[PDB]
Design a protein around this ligand. Structure first.
Ligand SMILES: Nc1nc2c(ncn2[C@@H]2O[C@H](COP(=O)(O)OP(=O)(O)NP(=O)(O)O)[C@@H](O)[C@H]2O)c(=O)[nH]1
Ligand SMILES: [Mg+2]
Length: 174
C-alpha cells in the first residue's frame, strides 16, 4: 500500500476544497469543513494496484509568513489548482510554483499537476486553455480544464497525480 499525500496548492482563494469534496462524495454541496491537521484517507485502485491517498486542503496561505510552507513540506505531491474566471489565480499560483521546490530542496523529482476549475463557464473564460497549457508546460506538467459543478474531470487530477508520482518519483532517473 502506497500512502501518497496530495496538497491542494494554489493562488490562495480559488476553490481547491471544491475538487476535494467532489473526489470524496462525488457530489457538489457546500458545508465548509474546518482544517488544521485533520486529513482525509481512503483506498483506491490504480491500474491494478491499491494505494492510499491522503488529501489535505489548504486555505488562504497568503497570510502566514512561513507557516504555509509546512503544508507543502507535509506532502509528497502537489496540485496547483486555479480558476479561469479569476486571472489573479493563475498568476499567484505561479508564485507558489517556485515555493514548492523550496520545501523539497533535498528531493529531485517533484510531482506536480495544474488544473483550472470554473470550466463550466466557457463564455466567462479569460484565460485560454491553450495559453494555460503552454505556460504551465514550462514547469513540466500538463494543464487540464475541470468543473467542480459537473464533477466530470475533477477526479482526473487526483488519479493522474498519483500515477505521476509512482512513475516519476520512483524513477529517480529520467
Ligand atoms: N461554478 C463553480 N463554482 C466553483 C467551482 N469551484 C469552486 N466554486 C465555488 O467557489 C466557492 C469556493 O470559495 P470559498 O469556499 O469562499 O473559498 P475557497 O475558494 O474554497 N478557498 P478558501 O477556503 O481559502 O476561502 C464556492 O461558492 C464554490 O461553489 C467550480 O469549479 N465551479
Ligand atoms: Mg475552501
Amino acid at each position: 500500500l502506497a500512502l501518497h499525500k496530495v496538497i491542494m496548492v494554489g493562488s490562495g482563494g480559488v476553490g481547491k476544497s471544491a475538487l476535494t469534496l467532489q473526489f470524496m462524495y462525488d457530489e457538489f454541496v457546500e458545508d465548509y469543513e474546518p482544517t488544521k491537521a485533520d486529513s482525509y484517507r481512503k483506498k483506491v485502485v490504480l491500474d491494478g494496484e491499491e494505494v492510499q491517498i491522503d488529501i489535505l486542503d489548504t486555505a488562504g496561505l497568503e497570510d502566514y509568513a512561513a507557516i504555509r510552507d509546512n503544508y507543502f513540506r507535509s506532502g509528497e505531491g502537489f496540485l496547483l489548482v486555479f480558476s479561469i474566471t479569476e486571472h489573479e489565480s493563475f498568476t499567484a499560483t505561479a508564485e507558489f510554483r517556485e515555493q514548492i521546490l523550496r520545501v523539497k530542496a533535498e528531493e529531485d523529482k517533484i510531482p506536480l499537476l495544474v488544473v483550472g476549475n470554473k470550466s463550466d463557464l466557457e463564455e466567462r473564460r479569460q484565460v485560454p486553455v491553450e495559453e494555460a497549457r503552454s505556460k504551465a508546460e514550462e514547469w513540466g506538467v500538463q494543464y487540464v480544464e475541470t468543473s467542480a459543478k459537473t464533477r466530470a474531470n475533477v477526479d482526473k487530477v487526483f488519479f493522474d497525480l498519483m500515477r505521476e508520482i509512482r512513475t516519476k518519483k520512483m524513477s529517480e532517473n529520467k
